[PDB]
Amino acid sequence: LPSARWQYCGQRAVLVQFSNGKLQSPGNMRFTLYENKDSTNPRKRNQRILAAETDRLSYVGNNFGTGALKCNTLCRHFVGILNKTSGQMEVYDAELFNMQPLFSD
Amino acid sequence: GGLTCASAPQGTLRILEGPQQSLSGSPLQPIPASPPPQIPPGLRPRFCAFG
């Protein structure tokens, strides 16, 4: 019955939810994330956009618009690491992004 | 600005509020049954036959 010391250390590690399938073959794929300017009003704490550069398509992931998922607001998402020699499951705040390929207008 | 991918996640944990056992161990509370109708005390012949 294994245990793990819960050492909460604090940054928000992104997690990806592809609307196409599973990313099972990673390769040359560039990932960049975007944050709003005005940090004054409390909407900047949720405004974040993740962009995915592939040569074929570009995948974009929101937190606010129509299609942004409700699993990271009605429930929190954490990330365990479990440095096995020390035996401490150190925990990071996380978000899940449901990515959707961009086409046109 | 890398954001390189990592390996597959090697386990999930689900945390939720568990129900208490001490509220789960109580015996039942039946409604007490009303008694069957009993003969009211102090009954006697109030009618003597005429004449």
Contact between chains at A80 and B5 (C-beta distance less than 8 A): no
d(CA A13, CA B18): 28
CB contact under 8 A, B3 and A26: no
Q: A22 contacts in B (CB within 8 Å)?
A: none
List Cβ<8 Å contacts ≥24 apart for B13-20: B13/A80
Q: Are A88 and A97 in contact (CB under 8 A)?
A: no
Rounded Cα gap, residues A42 and A64, in angstroms: 13
Written as six digits, the tokens of B45 are 């012949």
- Stated as kind and residue range, the H or E segment containing A30 is strand A30-35
Contact between A80 and B3 using a beta-carbon 8 Å cutoff: no
Calculate the alpha carbon distances from B38 to A103, B33, B35, B51 in Å.
86, 14, 8, 34
Burial A43-69 (b: 16+ CB within 10 A, else e): eeeebbbbbbeeeeeebebbbeeeeee
User: What is the Cα–Cα distance from A101 to B29, expressed in whole angstroms?
Assistant: 60
Nearest to A33 among B3, B4, B5 (CB): B3
Contacts of B5 in chain A (CB under 8 A): 23, 26, 29, 31
Q: Distance between alpha carbon B11 and the CA centroid of its chain, in Å?
A: 39
Nearest chain A residue to B11 by CA distance is A80
Chain A, 5 to 44: residues with Cβ < 8 Å from chain B are: 14, 23, 26, 29, 31-33
* Contact flag A14-B11 (C-beta cutoff 8 Å): no
Resolution, given in Å to one decimal, reads 3.3
Q: What amino acid is encoded at B26 in this protein? A: S
* Distance between CA atoms of residues A79 and A14, nearest Å: 10
Q: Is B11 on the interface with A (CB under 8 A)?
A: yes
Other Cβ atoms within 10 Å of A80 Cβ, number? 16
Q: Which token pair is A97?
A: 């992004």
Task: Give contacts of B2 with chain A, Cβ < 8 Å.
Answer: 31
